[PDB]
Design an enzyme around this catalytic site. Structure first.
Site, PDB file in Angstrom:
ATOM      1  N   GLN D  14      58.454  45.405  43.033  1.00  0.00           N
ATOM      2  CA  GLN D  14      58.917  44.673  44.208  1.00  0.00           C
ATOM      3  C   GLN D  14      58.147  43.364  44.398  1.00  0.00           C
ATOM      4  O   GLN D  14      58.754  42.334  44.712  1.00  0.00           O
ATOM      5  CB  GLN D  14      58.858  45.540  45.472  1.00  0.00           C
ATOM      6  N   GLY D 139      48.700  55.206  43.502  1.00  0.00           N
ATOM      7  CA  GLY D 139      50.100  55.398  43.185  1.00  0.00           C
ATOM      8  C   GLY D 139      50.310  55.743  41.721  1.00  0.00           C
ATOM      9  O   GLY D 139      49.510  55.335  40.858  1.00  0.00           O
ATOM     10  N   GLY D 142      51.884  53.247  38.580  1.00  0.00           N
ATOM     11  CA  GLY D 142      51.057  52.052  38.707  1.00  0.00           C
ATOM     12  C   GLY D 142      49.638  52.194  38.177  1.00  0.00           C
ATOM     13  O   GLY D 142      49.132  51.287  37.534  1.00  0.00           O
ATOM     14  N   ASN D 224      55.220  41.561  50.736  1.00  0.00           N
ATOM     15  CA  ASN D 224      55.550  41.090  49.401  1.00  0.00           C
ATOM     16  C   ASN D 224      55.706  39.583  49.328  1.00  0.00           C
ATOM     17  O   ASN D 224      55.199  38.950  48.396  1.00  0.00           O
ATOM     18  CB  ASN D 224      56.827  41.752  48.904  1.00  0.00           C
ATOM     19  N   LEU D 248      45.313  29.556  29.732  1.00  0.00           N
ATOM     20  CA  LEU D 248      44.896  30.904  30.209  1.00  0.00           C
ATOM     21  C   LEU D 248      43.439  31.318  29.947  1.00  0.00           C
ATOM     22  O   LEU D 248      42.869  32.085  30.734  1.00  0.00           O
ATOM     23  CB  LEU D 248      45.849  32.005  29.705  1.00  0.00           C
ATOM     24  N   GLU D 250      40.984  28.736  29.458  1.00  0.00           N
ATOM     25  CA  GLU D 250      40.386  27.636  30.236  1.00  0.00           C
ATOM     26  C   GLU D 250      40.455  27.818  31.765  1.00  0.00           C
ATOM     27  O   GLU D 250      39.570  27.375  32.500  1.00  0.00           O
ATOM     28  CB  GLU D 250      41.072  26.315  29.823  1.00  0.00           C
TER      29      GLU D 250
HETATM   30  N1  LIG Z   1      51.974  45.385  48.577  1.00  0.00           N
HETATM   31  C1  LIG Z   1      52.837  46.363  48.324  1.00  0.00           C
HETATM   32  N2  LIG Z   1      52.351  47.629  48.089  1.00  0.00           N
HETATM   33  C2  LIG Z   1      53.176  48.677  47.832  1.00  0.00           C
HETATM   34  C3  LIG Z   1      54.541  48.493  47.790  1.00  0.00           C
HETATM   35  N3  LIG Z   1      55.074  49.713  47.515  1.00  0.00           N
HETATM   36  C4  LIG Z   1      54.094  50.636  47.372  1.00  0.00           C
HETATM   37  N4  LIG Z   1      52.918  49.993  47.585  1.00  0.00           N
HETATM   38  C5  LIG Z   1      51.565  50.519  47.529  1.00  0.00           C
HETATM   39  O1  LIG Z   1      51.366  50.995  46.222  1.00  0.00           O
HETATM   40  C6  LIG Z   1      50.713  52.225  46.253  1.00  0.00           C
HETATM   41  C7  LIG Z   1      51.718  53.227  45.722  1.00  0.00           C
HETATM   42  O2  LIG Z   1      52.086  52.768  44.440  1.00  0.00           O
HETATM   43  P1  LIG Z   1      53.567  53.043  43.871  1.00  0.00           P
HETATM   44  O3  LIG Z   1      54.119  51.851  43.083  1.00  0.00           O
HETATM   45  O4  LIG Z   1      54.452  53.390  45.019  1.00  0.00           O
HETATM   46  O5  LIG Z   1      53.455  54.327  42.896  1.00  0.00           O
HETATM   47  P2  LIG Z   1      54.214  54.409  41.487  1.00  0.00           P
HETATM   48  O6  LIG Z   1      54.099  55.791  40.836  1.00  0.00           O
HETATM   49  O7  LIG Z   1      53.596  53.378  40.661  1.00  0.00           O
HETATM   50  O8  LIG Z   1      55.758  54.088  41.795  1.00  0.00           O
HETATM   51  P3  LIG Z   1      56.790  55.317  41.944  1.00  0.00           P
HETATM   52  O9  LIG Z   1      57.451  55.662  40.601  1.00  0.00           O
HETATM   53  O10 LIG Z   1      57.814  54.911  42.934  1.00  0.00           O
HETATM   54  O11 LIG Z   1      56.063  56.590  42.434  1.00  0.00           O
HETATM   55  C8  LIG Z   1      50.313  52.449  47.699  1.00  0.00           C
HETATM   56  O12 LIG Z   1      49.024  51.904  47.828  1.00  0.00           O
HETATM   57  C9  LIG Z   1      51.295  51.634  48.508  1.00  0.00           C
HETATM   58  O13 LIG Z   1      50.739  51.136  49.702  1.00  0.00           O
HETATM   59  C10 LIG Z   1      55.051  47.200  48.022  1.00  0.00           C
HETATM   60  O14 LIG Z   1      56.251  46.955  48.004  1.00  0.00           O
HETATM   61  N5  LIG Z   1      54.201  46.147  48.292  1.00  0.00           N
HETATM   62 MG   LIG Z   2      41.118  19.674  28.566  1.00  0.00          MG
END
Ligand SMILES: Nc1nc2c(ncn2[C@@H]2O[C@H](COP(=O)(O)OP(=O)(O)OP(=O)(O)O)[C@@H](O)[C@H]2O)c(=O)[nH]1
Ligand SMILES: [Mg+2]
Ligand SMILES: Nc1nc2c(ncn2[C@@H]2O[C@H](COP(=O)(O)OP(=O)(O)OP(=O)(O)O)[C@@H](O)[C@H]2O)c(=O)[nH]1
Ligand SMILES: Nc1nc2c(ncn2[C@@H]2O[C@H](COP(=O)(O)OP(=O)(O)O)[C@@H](O)[C@H]2O)c(=O)[nH]1
Ligand SMILES: Nc1nc2c(ncn2[C@@H]2O[C@H](COP(=O)(O)OP(=O)(O)O)[C@@H](O)[C@H]2O)c(=O)[nH]1
Ligand SMILES: COc1ccc(S(=O)(=O)Nc2cccnc2Nc2ccc(O)cc2)cc1
Ligand SMILES: COc1ccc(S(=O)(=O)Nc2cccnc2Nc2ccc(O)cc2)cc1
EC number: 3.6.5.-
Lengths: 427, 419, 124, 428, 419
Positions: D14, D139, D142, D224, D248, D250
């Site tokens: 996102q 998460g 991630g 976002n 990148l 530098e």
């Molecule tokens: N800044 C921001 N943080 C997010 C967003 N969605 C989830 N988070 C944060 O990301 C963390 C969760 O990570 P996710 O991406 O939801 O977990 P994931 O396993 O990687 O993704 P899923 O497959 O949906 O479970 C938490 O700390 C949330 O606060 C978003 O749209 N923007």
């Molecule tokens: Mg130069």
């Protein structure tokens, strides 16, 4: 009998170029070579028309030698008498003598011999060169050693150009000077120093030239040299041939260096005054201002003296003139030696270079003296040297072309000797 | 008797593209075409900086090196762009990194050869090659890194001939890479061993000359390049004009440097921006008017060459030169005798009726080195950004091994304030 | 001061003669050595032919540094390759056997219904 | 030369979706791929896009998620047309909020396909530079999949820098209880395969949106947009080519002094809601914990390299006299052994914001990247959570469940311990 | 991503038939027919609970097991009777016995397969099957006995996917079989080993909520079924509606349970019978308003998920949620950090403008177990009714072997009231 000129080094060369010029005008030779024994002393009658000098010109760059086979006189010499070496000497003895010199020496020494070859009794060599400055010190040195080998008795007379603060090229000048002068001194017979300063002084007092050129200074040296060679180009009494040169100036094989003093130097513009008197010009020969190595021989002694007159002059005055120079002036003769004054008259009235700076004279004098005060130059040099070397100032460039730290020591150590030699004749 | 030019690295190439079009104007060269000027002297010494090709044309002896396209197309699309021979350009493609190691070892040595490969064909064409000169940055890698390498490959091929460079020693204002001390120190070492003369152009001076004395507010790399280009013209003149001396660049070296290690000149200029003789002389011997960031006060002059431009009687140039060796008699080492020589050329620069330029072997230079080595040892301290070099295959101690070497050169200029 | 003057030489176009004025009053270069100017050339060689063999050094250091960069780079890649699937082929091995030791914990309370189910086939 | 984006994880994705969007409006690319703006042929904005076919302008991007849901939104609402159907990867079953799963179990499977697709993109690049990896800190995928990626990327791509943009998890806007675990788990594997790493504290951003943006209870797509900007200001350097920060290595040669200490501290300049500010003032805004971007405080910790990244209508003539006075009436704070920084990068490109967005169009914005030692406030604030769960094996078993090891949890924390010591050990 | 439903045993089936038609209403399903409603969201997550067949139609993923006809024709002749797929019904014929052993060993395993034979179809039809959920009685055999078996056969076939059950732990008032303790304990054991989460719905609570707070005099199995159905609605929502989180039921488990053994939730509801936000929050966190018979006082909360229904600003839901973690700050274990998460769905239940629901991992639960095991060891005493099981081929010591295992789980919840 005969008489070969060698001119090495940009100075060496230009001095030559501009005293050959004066020989010519004096001998009525048109630049092409043709004139419409005697003066054979210096030129060979080549082919049927021409009159080539018995001369070689060497330089380690073209530049200067090129200028000679450019502007008339181009015709005078022979294409082979001018030798040129592509890469420079770069302002150091080391390079000239050992590195860039090693190469060209065999060719120059050959060509010289080509000239010696058509001489039924060649006399000597007149070597003209710069004292400091690259090839003038270094290559000249290497030359004289070798010339001393291929030519047994055969005198060598050097005309050195003692370097001067104001008109100079190089910082390292002192080094080369003391460097060469050391190797160079025991292969030469008598040696005419020319202080560039001195000459630039004359050009400022007497000639009125605000800031004089090289080719300004050169014309003047021209004259003095022409006055010293005079003796053997025309032929007439005293210094009739090269050996007489040392007989009359050098009583000690080491003490070569006589002191020259040209007579009347005055600028055309003055060219119509009243002429100067036999008396006055003699009494000019005694004057630090009219000297030719900036020193002062009122304080040091004299050990052989030689009035060399040119022009319209009966001795009956020259006598009564010397006479009074004694009674109202600085006698100053050493311990063990008559009181000199070997006096040469040549009747040939002095001609000067036409669009020159000086005027045509009725009578000129020349005064060659072996004073002991000429060793003022010998220290004024050393002191510079001493005081660079005292920190190996530039030394490395020499060790660089492949010399020795110790040569520098043992060359100065010879001037130390000389300077003692000299002043020990007092006272 | 004939010299080639290497112009490597952005700062360096930018310097040279200005250089080339100022000196090209002096002589009179179109974008390509040969001569257009009522002057005549010009082409006597055009030999020295311009190998010439068929038809009219004049083309400079020029090698352009960089590790990225960028700064080259910048020349080719700008000033006298059309003029440099097509495959006299050496492209990088790679990164340059602003990292000496890259430029000297990996991404640089990489190329090197295609550069040498061109220098070979200009040099072995030159009828009697005098030597090479090079322009470049000292902090930042493509120029300082490959450049120092270049010369270390030039010597070796050509021990023989002499080795000239304008290197721009860099400063903490008007710069970018936190790293520059590192880069420069590494090169400073390299230079000290492998060049015969180096003009030290300080950007710290250069910038200061604009804002302390010029009303120049937001100084580009432009105005400030202008100075270097002007200083280079002035410096070169005697190589490329008259027939006063004739200046061998060798002759220059042997006369200018007493001691082999200390070939570092601060330059200085006459009038400035984008004049009387007296007012020209103490303007060229003013500290506030040098090309390096020192003050030729703390530190005496070893030897100095100086060069005046424009038909005016030198009977006065003597009279004034000789003066500042008394109005400053103290500040010229007494152990080298007549250690100031001056020359005059009577054909002025772009604009300006009267100019003059100053070449200076001063131990004041120690001031500059000391000041870089002092933000260097302040960084190599807890071993800072070093891991950018560590990682490219360089040694931990090679750094201290240059420090040490430079730190020497400091204490040798110190050593020469003697008796 | 009042002369007496001897006189050498009368000539075509000249005259000489000394003039002694107050009484006087008192009481091996050979050759061999151009074998010097080669022993100087045997230095300009030893000095050059060394700051040559000295770039021979400061070259095959390039060799060293370009090569200890790659030496130490594939060092990373082909350490961090098996830093994986030997810490991932200990992982698929880990779960799978922990799956099975749940099935063997579940076949064992399954061979147990079988032994009391045919134990109903024992009550009269 | 070139520059590939990777977005893994619902957040990762996102964030991407909503700064790619911003790249577009900044480069005048209509969602329908085509730009009547200058054009192309297949330089300048080429850094990030490939000129595909004859009309289009595709991003050099891959999007990975282990659920569809989020990736499906992209091929749903316009921009649908922007990417190429292949560049978006989706994995049917979830990550389920644990590293273990993402890295070993449900990740093992998809990694080969993603790593391939990446190469496809790398394949049409005459000199590709690096990877910008966007991912969530806590998460599921991630942490876990991102980790596995970087290891592998590190193997299939030697030098080639990797720049990660992490989203450091915040109490108030969070999914999972087991978050701390994942964060400290990944960060450990992750740290020696990355070059420089931009942390983004969700809290911090949510804070900014409450003080400065006035949004009572801010969305994801609220936060976002704000991240978008900051990232867009960091990438800015190499999308037009602008005075300083120009490639990148530098760009970062600048920031990280030690193989570990990656994490710089970002601080966007003027944030103000639609419905001008002085060069001086916005500089002096970059120094303020409230405008920060990882909730900490660097008035107490030291500084080890600093970078003013301006955007818009600005002559350095002020930027100078502005820095100047930031030194005379404030907190200098520079470490022992390092000039006093302030590499200054000006891009003339005035900042465009999202049209019906929350923010207004500005004349001048600043960016300030700093490597402070106080960014390790986040490093413990995390650990302490971790420490105190693990102290009872709180959820541990779920990881041993998908097949991990008790010891890995030890030896990952044992690395933050190390780092935390590394950091604070840079003090004068 | 898609779940199946087993609904076994009278009490179980009766719970489910209510369940099905409340959730069927939320989405909008006729007796068979598909959609009829002005709402739109609904069918995004209808995927999860409704495998769909040709034409319109929607039919729930449903398996109905019983050991007698009786309670099945009760569905088919009643509410949304027409809706479940014909041979998705598994008939018993036999006795059920109200005797765990029968249901788990003889008369039950008897059938088992024809059930598994249906779950296999639905599951291997499901595009990505999440897991199963099951509803049933704990005392009384067909539901608890076969059910525990079922799951012990589901796991093993599917270890893989996750395992959910609403099991109704029974009480000495509103019950019939002197034996239930026995039955329940035996199942309690079974569950602890083989499920991932179990909602503990107490009939003791359920009956209390009616008469302690409602004035409901002679509570049917009807009113009282009503609560369970409502509670299950509330609980499920996030699986089957929005796009807030997306709730994996796996995600749910891993987050909700620290320790593998302790997957026991007490649920709880907002409004009740057959609402403001604040008055909604402490009504959901009120003891006297839990779905299990404990008092979330003696015993702290391990972790709690909660879920709010109906368009109202959550800027207030945060503000209040955050409040009861301070107004009760003590009663949430400090060793799991942010251990309350809450979510919001903006589409109300059957009737009602505003609702809310509570999911609760509390060690208060210990209270429940302890109270059954206390009328169990009070019965297994001089080995009471046991001969009903002894005789069906069960072991003397298997009883004590469950006692012991349950008795553990008591002293593990006790074990977690720590530091
Ligand atoms: N800044 C921001 N943080 C997010 C967003 N969605 C989830 N988070 C944060 O990301 C963390 C969760 O990570 P996710 O991406 O939801 O977990 P994931 O396993 O990687 O993704 P899923 O497959 O949906 O479970 C938490 O700390 C949330 O606060 C978003 O749209 N923007
Ligand atoms: Mg130069
Ligand atoms: N009198 C006079 N002295 C000169 C002349 N040219 C140079 N000099 C002096 O000679 C010295 C320099 O000697 P050079 O002949 O130039 O040096 P070189 O190596 O012999 O000649 P190059 O090959 O040009 O380097 C300095 O003392 C100058 O003052 C000149 O034309 N006349
Ligand atoms: N005077 C001059 N110096 C410059 C110029 N550009 C950069 N520099 C200096 O040189 C250093 C970096 O040189 P750069 O060309 O970027 O290095 P390279 O391209 O990797 O060789 C900086 O510290 C600058 O101060 C230029 O335009 N003119
Ligand atoms: N809430 C709910 N519980 C019930 C219902 N019917 C029975 N129960 C409880 O469940 C227990 C018996 O379940 P039952 O369905 O008869 O077992 P089975 O038919 O043999 O599977 C009794 O102790 C009751 O308390 C029902 O209508 N709803
Ligand atoms: C002060 O010491 C000297 C003496 C002579 C020389 S020189 O014969 O080499 N020529 C020279 C004198 C004065 C000024 N410039 C000179 N030449 C020159 C050549 C190339 C340059 O880039 C700068 C100057 C140089 C330095
Ligand atoms: C309190 O710890 C958590 C954190 C997150 C979750 S979740 O990502 O799985 N979703 C969720 C949050 C809050 C309330 N309910 C949730 N999901 C859910 C799914 C199925 C149910 O039967 C009940 C709730 C669950 C428990």
């Amino acid at each position: 009998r005969e008489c070969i000129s060698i001119h090495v080094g940009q100075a060496g060369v230009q001095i030559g170029n501009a005293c050959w010029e004066l020989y010519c005008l004096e001998h009525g030779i048109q630049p092409d070579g043709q004139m419409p024994d005697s003066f054979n002393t210096f030129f060979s009658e080549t082919g049927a028309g021409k009159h080539v000098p018995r001369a070689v010109f060497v330089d380690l760059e073209p530049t200067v030698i090129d200028e000679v086979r450019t502007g008339t006189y181009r015709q005078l010499f022979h294409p082979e008498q001018l030798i040129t070496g592509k890469e420079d000497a770069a302002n150091n003895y080391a390079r000239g003598h050992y590195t860039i010199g090693k190469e060209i020496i065999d060719l120059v020494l050959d060509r010289i011999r080509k000239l010696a070859d058509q001489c039924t009794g060649l006399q000597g060599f007149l070597v003209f060169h710069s004292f400091g400055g690259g090839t003038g010190s270094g290559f000249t040195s290497l030359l004289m050693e070798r010339l001393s080998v291929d030519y047994g008795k055969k005198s060598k007379l050097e005309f050195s150009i003692y370097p001067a603060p104001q008109v100079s090229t190089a910082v390292v000048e002192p080094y080369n000077s003391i460097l060469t002068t050391h190797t160079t001194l025991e292969h030469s017979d008598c040696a005419f120093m020319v202080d560039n300063e001195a000459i630039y002084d004359i050009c400022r007092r007497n000639l009125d030239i605000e800031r004089p050129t090289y080719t300004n200074l050169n014309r003047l040296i021209g004259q003095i040299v022409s006055s010293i060679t005079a003796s053997l180009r025309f032929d007439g009494a005293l210094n009739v041939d090269l050996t007489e040169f040392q007989t009359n100036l050098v009583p000690y094989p080491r003490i070569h260096f006589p002191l020259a003093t040209y007579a009347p130097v005055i600028s055309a513009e003055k060219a119509y005054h009243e002429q100067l008197s036999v008396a006055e010009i003699t009494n000019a020969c005694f004057e630090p201002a009219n000297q030719m190595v900036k020193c002062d021989p009122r304080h040091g002694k004299y050990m052989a003296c030689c009035l060399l007159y040119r022009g319209d002059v009966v001795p009956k005055d020259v006598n009564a003139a010397i006479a009074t120079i004694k009674t109202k002036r600085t006698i100053q003769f050493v311990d063990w030696c008559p009181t000199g004054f070997k006096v040469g008259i040549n009747y040939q009235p002095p001609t000067v270079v036409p669009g020159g700076d000086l005027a045509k004279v009725q009578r000129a004098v020349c005064m060659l003296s072996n004073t002991t005060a000429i060793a003022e130059a010998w220290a004024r040099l050393d002191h510079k040297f001493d005081l660079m070397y005292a920190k190996r100032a530039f030394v490395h460039w020499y060790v660089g072309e492949g010399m020795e730290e110790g040569e520098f020591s043992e060359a100065r150590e010879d001037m130390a000797a000389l300077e003692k030699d000299y002043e020990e004749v007092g006272v | 008797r004939e010299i080639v030019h290497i112009q490597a690295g952005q700062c360096g190439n930018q310097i040279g593209a200005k250089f080339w079009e100022v000196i090209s104007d002096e002589h009179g060269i179109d974008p390509t075409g040969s001569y257009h000027g009522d002057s005549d002297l010009q082409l006597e010494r055009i030999n020295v900086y311009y190998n010439e090709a068929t038809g009219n044309k004049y083309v400079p002896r020029a090698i352009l090196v960089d590790l990225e396209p960028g700064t080259m197309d910048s020349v080719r699309s700008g000033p006298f762009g059309q003029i440099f021979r097509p495959d006299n350009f050496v492209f990088g493609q790679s990164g340059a990194g602003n990292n000496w190691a890259k430029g000297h070892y990996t991404e640089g040595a990489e190329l090197v050869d295609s550069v040498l490969d061109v220098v070979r064909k200009e040099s072995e064409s030159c009828d009697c090659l005098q030597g090479f000169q090079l322009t470049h940055s000292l902090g930042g890698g493509t120029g300082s890194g490959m450049g120092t390498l270049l010369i270390s490959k030039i010597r070796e091929e050509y021990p023989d001939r002499i080795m000239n460079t304008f290197s721009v020693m860099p400063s903490p204002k008007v710069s970018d890479t936190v790293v520059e001390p590192y880069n420069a120190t590494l090169s400073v070492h390299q230079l000290v061993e492998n060049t015969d003369e180096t003009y030290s152009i300080d950007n710290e001076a250069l910038y200061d000359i604009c804002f302390r004395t010029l009303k120049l507010t937001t100084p580009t790399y432009g105005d400030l390049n202008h100075l270097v280009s002007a200083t280079m013209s002035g410096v070169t003149t005697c190589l490329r004009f008259p027939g006063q001396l004739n200046a061998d660049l060798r002759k220059l070296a042997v006369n200018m440097v007493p001691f082999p290690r200390l070939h570092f000149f601060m330059p200085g200029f006459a009038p400035l921006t984008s004049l009387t003789v007296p007012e020209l002389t103490q303007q060229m011997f003013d500290s506030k008017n040098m090309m390096a960031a020192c003050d030729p006060r703390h530190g005496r002059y070893l030897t100095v060459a100086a060069v005046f431009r424009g038909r005016m009687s030198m009977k006065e140039v003597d009279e004034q030169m000789l003066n500042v060796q008394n109005k400053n008699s103290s500040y010229f080492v007494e152990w080298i005798p007549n250690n100031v020589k001056t020359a005059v050329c009577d054909i002025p620069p772009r604009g300006l009726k009267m100019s003059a330029t100053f070449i200076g072997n001063s131990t004041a230079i120690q001031e500059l080195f000391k000041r870089i080595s002092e933000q260097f040892t302040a960084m190599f301290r807890r071993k800072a950004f070093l891991h950018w070099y560590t990682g490219e295959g360089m040694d931990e101690m090679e750094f201290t091994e240059a420090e040490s070497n430079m730190n020497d050169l400091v204490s040798e200029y110190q050593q020469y304030q003697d008796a | 001061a009042d002369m007496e003057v001897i006189e050498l030489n009368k000539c075509t176009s000249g005259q000489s003669f000394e003039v002694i004025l107050k009484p006087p009053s008192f009481d091996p270069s050979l050759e061999e050595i151009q074998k010097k100017l080669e022993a100087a050339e045997e230095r300009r060689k030893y000095q050059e032919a060394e700051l040559l063999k000295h770039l021979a050094e400061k070259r095959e250091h390039e060799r060293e540094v370009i090569q200890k960069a790659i030496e130490e780079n594939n060092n990373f890649i082909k350490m961090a390759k098996e830093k994986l699937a030997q810490k991932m082929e200990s992982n698929k091995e880990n779960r799978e056997a922990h799956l099975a030791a749940m099935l063997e914990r579940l076949q064992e309370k399954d061979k147990h219904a079988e032994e009391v189910r045919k134990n109903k086939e024992l009550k009269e």
